[PDB]
Amino acid sequence: MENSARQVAQDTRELHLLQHIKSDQSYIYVFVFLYYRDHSVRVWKLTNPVSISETLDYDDLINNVNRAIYYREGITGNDAGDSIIDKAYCEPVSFMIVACGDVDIQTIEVNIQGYDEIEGVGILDSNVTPPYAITATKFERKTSGGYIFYTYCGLFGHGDRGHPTMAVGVEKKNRNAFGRMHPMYVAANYKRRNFWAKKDWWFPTEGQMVEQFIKQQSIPYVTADNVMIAPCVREIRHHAHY
Amino acid sequence: MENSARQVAQDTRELHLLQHIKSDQSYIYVFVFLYYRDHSVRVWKLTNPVSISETLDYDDLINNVNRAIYYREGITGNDAGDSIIDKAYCEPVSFMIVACGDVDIQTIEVNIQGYDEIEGVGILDSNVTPPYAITATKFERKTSGGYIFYTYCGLFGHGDRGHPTMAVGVEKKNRNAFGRMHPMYVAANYKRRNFWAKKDWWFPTEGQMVEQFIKQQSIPYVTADNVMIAPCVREIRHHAHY
Amino acid sequence: MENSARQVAQDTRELHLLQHIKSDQSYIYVFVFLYYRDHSVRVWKLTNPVSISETLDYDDLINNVNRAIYYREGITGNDAGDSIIDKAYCEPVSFMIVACGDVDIQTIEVNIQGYDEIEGVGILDSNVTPPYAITATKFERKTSGGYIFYTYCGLFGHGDRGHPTMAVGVEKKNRNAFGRMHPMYVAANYKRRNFWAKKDWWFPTEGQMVEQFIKQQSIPYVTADNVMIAPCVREIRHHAHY
Numbered sequence: 001m002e003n004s005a006r007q008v009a010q011d012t013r014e015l016h017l018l019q020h021i022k023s024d025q026s027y028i029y030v031f032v033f034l035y036y037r038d039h040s041v042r043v044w045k046l047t048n049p050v051s052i053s054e055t056l057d058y059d060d061l062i063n064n065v066n067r068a069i070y071y072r073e074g075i076t077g078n079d080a081g082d083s084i085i086d087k088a089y090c091e092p093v094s095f096m097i098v099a100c101g102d103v104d105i106q107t108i109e110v111n112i113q114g115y116d117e118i119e120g121v122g123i124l125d126s127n128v129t130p131p132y133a134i135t136a137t138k139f140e141r142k143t144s145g146g147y148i149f150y151t152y153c154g155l156f157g158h159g160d161r162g163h164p165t166m167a168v169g170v171e172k173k174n175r176n177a178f179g180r181m182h183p184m185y186v187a188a189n190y191k192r193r194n195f196w197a198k199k200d201w202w203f204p205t206e207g208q209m210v211e212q213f214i215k216q217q218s219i220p221y222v223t224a225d226n227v228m229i230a231p232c233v234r235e236i237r238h239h240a241h242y
Numbered sequence: 243m244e245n246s247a248r249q250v251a252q253d254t255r256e257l258h259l260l261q262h263i264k265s266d267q268s269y270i271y272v273f274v275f276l277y278y279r280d281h282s283v284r285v286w287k288l289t290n291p292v293s294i295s296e297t298l299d300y301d302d303l304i305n306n307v308n309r310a311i312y313y314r315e316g317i318t319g320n321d322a323g324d325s326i327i328d329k330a331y332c333e334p335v336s337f338m339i340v341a342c343g344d345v346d347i348q349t350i351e352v353n354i355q356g357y358d359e360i361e362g363v364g365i366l367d368s369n370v371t372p373p374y375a376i377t378a379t380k381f382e383r384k385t386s387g388g389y390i391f392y393t394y395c396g397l398f399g400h401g402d403r404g405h406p407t408m409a410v411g412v413e414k415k416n417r418n419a420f421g422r423m424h425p426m427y428v429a430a431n432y433k434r435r436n437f438w439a440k441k442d443w444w445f446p447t448e449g450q451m452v453e454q455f456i457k458q459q460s461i462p463y464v465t466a467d468n469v470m471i472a473p474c475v476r477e478i479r480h481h482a483h484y
Numbered sequence: 485m486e487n488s489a490r491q492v493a494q495d496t497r498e499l500h501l502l503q504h505i506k507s508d509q510s511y512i513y514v515f516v517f518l519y520y521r522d523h524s525v526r527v528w529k530l531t532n533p534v535s536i537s538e539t540l541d542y543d544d545l546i547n548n549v550n551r552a553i554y555y556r557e558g559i560t561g562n563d564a565g566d567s568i569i570d571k572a573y574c575e576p577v578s579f580m581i582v583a584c585g586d587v588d589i590q591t592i593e594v595n596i597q598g599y600d601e602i603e604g605v606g607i608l609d610s611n612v613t614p615p616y617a618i619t620a621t622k623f624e625r626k627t628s629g630g631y632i633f634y635t636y637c638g639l640f641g642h643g644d645r646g647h648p649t650m651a652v653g654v655e656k657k658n659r660n661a662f663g664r665m666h667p668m669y670v671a672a673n674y675k676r677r678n679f680w681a682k683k684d685w686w687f688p689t690e691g692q693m694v695e696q697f698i699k700q701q702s703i704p705y706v707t708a709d710n711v712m713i714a715p716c717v718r719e720i721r722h723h724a725h726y
């Protein structure tokens with residue numbers, strides 16, 4: 001039965017799943033999970049065939065389901081507000097970044113700023129890559145069978161980054177030399193620079209999100225109690241691997 | 243009178259119009275027309291000098307003139323809704339894609355998904371190019387004098403794609419070898435990657451749209467009864483063409 | 485005291501500030517200031533490490549603090565409106581473009597259109613670069629110590645461009661030959677194509693904006709009475725300069 005052609009059809013499916021990751025036919029993904037004091041979750045899908053590059057502005061990071069200038073002016077300039085509310089309830093408590101598919105985690109950047117998006121003391125001194133944006137080594141490398149994904153979690157806090165904005169970018173891993181934006185390829189990937197624009201959802205709790213979305217879309221994930229929710233494809237190979 | 247310099251000035255204008263298509267000085271366009279049960283039309287202009295790449299999210303495809311989480315959760319995960327409305331009235335009935343200007347129709351992709359934008363059974367198995375996205379050969383090639391344009395129509399239906407999202411991309415035709423993203427050109431076109439961002443309008447009926455917009459902007463179009471509405475520039479040439 | 489190591493630390497800071505402009509580690513910026521009849525200002529930050537490319541649509545250019553189809557249809561097609569309001573109060577009176585950081589002003593384009601974004605008489609005749617979009621030579625070159633920035637101001641008026649849309653793009657100055665989108669570099673900058681998406685603020689008056697934002701973020705600026713508000717870093721060099 002182990003060598004029945006039907007089983008080998010199953011084998012083909014699972015070899016396909018693992019090889020699809022490295023293939024040019026798959027997407028790379030960054031999912032940004034935002035956790036609010038009300039226990040709800042706002043989720044952003046960032047995705048592209050080869051290169052993810054997105055800004056999540058303040059209005060993208062606050063809770064838009066359990067929900068202005070008087071407050072906004074106070075997070076625009078120092079002491080410039082006219083609001084009796086010091087900190088908006090709907091600003092996120094924590095985040096998790098999940099990088100999955102064929103991401104080269106070494107190319108990831110997660111650059112979290114305050115409301116004005118301006119790093120440092122003034123615009124002409126801003127650095128394109130502040131040290132805290134070089135987050136690659138701080139991701140945790142998770143494995144589920146032959147699948148590999150990466151997580152990075154943290155708190156936004158009660159300071160400037162409690163009114164957050166985020167720039168996120170990552171490249172598809174290239175294990176060989178022909179660049180996915182080499183001149184013979186660039187136009188085909190440039191045509192897909194917006195496949196797909198950032199996409200969001202909201203869920204009342206993490207547990208309900210896991211049942212209705214994480215599991216249904218087979219998105220790799222780690223819960224608050226540190227449980228891996230991810231598909232698992234066991235490795236198939238006819239010969240030893242180094 | 244046929245060889246009066248004034249007539250030759252007219253000739254210059256019309257030769258200009260036909261040659262402008264192939265020139266680097268023109269835009270390529272994809273117009274997405276969305277037809278609602280109320281007979282109104284929402285229209286998206288997608289445009290770029292060399293490379294169109296856009297996502298039309300669910301909120302871009304529904305009728306925003308004749309117009310949430312309780313319903314949205316039901317199209318996010320299976321059986322996860324809390325809405326007495328099964329299908330929103332404002333979801334589009336049908337679409338037409340019009341590709342015009344110097345498009346290379348062979349490079350077009352029209353990738354229509356459900357609300358979650360995720361092709362296939364799970365994110366790690368999604369294909370960047372599902373077979374139904376390779377729509378080039380299904381477009382109808384329309385001619386109006388020397389002008390050429392392409393149309394593709396269809397129904398969204400009452401299933402997952404009745405809650406649609408769309409990725410659309412196409413390149414400008416290059417009849418020669420110097421790529422419009424060759425290293426000596428790439429930076430100049432990269433600087434125009436967002437000339438222009440997707441732009442929308444709404445019209446109460448197709449007939450009123452044709453008078454007030456299709457004709458006024460000289461946009462090639464085909465009505466519901468299959469009538470071509472397009473400018474016509476008759477071909478001018480001093481010698482036979484193969 | 486002039487050669488105390490503490491002073492030389494100050495010298496290092498200021499040499500850093502001037503050299504940071506030309507370094508790959510800085511951003512380029514275009515700020516678009518929009519001035520309304522109510523004396524308020526809406527401000528857009530456009531920014532990127534190497535290449536700015538943005539559309540400011542009509543809803544981005546009108547006053548969204550001191551604030552539809554019946555009017556919108558009238559600026560979509562000629563005489564197609566159903567509004568008793570001829571011109572919306574919230575459309576901007578004037579603009580100023582501030583290009584700063586290491587911009588190559590020779591690559592700037594400021595293309596202002598009417599509501600439909602369509603240059604010329606019809607879409608197939610639109611030019612990607614209308615003459616008025618080649619604004620480089622019309623900018624005023626401002627200096628503040630070793631800093632250089634560029635301003636361009638004007639009125640929107642009471643015609644088509646009184647219902648404005650804008651495409652803006654500019655490249656980082658490259659004083660040498662290795663292109664920032666050369667094949668060996670392109671993927672790293674493509675990954676940052678959306679660092680950062682366009683970002684806006686609003687201020688009740690120019691004077692309050694200058695105190696709470698222009699000065700706080702050290703953004704180069706020129707007020708309505710023609711006063712330069714900009715940081716100043718005096719040039720430091722140990723030898724004569726040509």
Ligand SMILES: Nc1nc2c(ncn2[C@@H]2O[C@H](COP(=O)(O)OP(=O)(O)OP(=O)(O)O)[C@@H](O)[C@H]2O)c(=O)[nH]1
Nearest residue numbers: 112113114132155156157158159160161162163164
């Ligand atoms: N990384 C970093 N964060 C800073 C800095 N200065 C202030 N912060 C803010 O510090 C916050 C988190 O720091 P914590 O020390 O845990 O304080 P908190 O829980 O936010 O509450 P506060 O004491 O009010 O800051 C974030 O919201 C940041 O915006 C800084 O220099 N570097």
Ligand SMILES: Nc1nc2c(ncn2[C@@H]2O[C@H](COP(=O)(O)OP(=O)(O)OP(=O)(O)O)[C@@H](O)[C@H]2O)c(=O)[nH]1
Nearest residue numbers: 354355356374397398399400401402403404405406
């Ligand atoms: N192309 C494609 N469409 C599918 C598939 N499964 C379901 N659909 C949906 O089928 C719908 C159109 O199919 P039809 O057979 O004409 O049915 P309908 O008019 O939408 O009404 P239903 O019978 O409820 O599906 C679209 O909304 C699709 O989302 C599939 O496997 N392939």
Ligand SMILES: Nc1nc2c(ncn2[C@@H]2O[C@H](COP(=O)(O)OP(=O)(O)OP(=O)(O)O)[C@@H](O)[C@H]2O)c(=O)[nH]1
Nearest residue numbers: 596597598616639640641642643644645646647648
């Ligand atoms: N550059 C340019 N602007 C034009 C043209 N035709 C109309 N305009 C409009 O003219 C307006 C500014 O021109 P002005 O002569 O100062 O007139 P105005 O103050 O806007 O008031 P009007 O007399 O109603 O136009 C802008 O809003 C433009 O949209 C044109 O051919 N070229």
Ligand SMILES: [Mg+2]
Nearest residue numbers: 157158159160
């Ligand atoms: Mg803090």
Ligand SMILES: [Mg+2]
Nearest residue numbers: 399400401402
């Ligand atoms: Mg169906």
Ligand SMILES: [Mg+2]
Nearest residue numbers: 641642643644
């Ligand atoms: Mg005018």
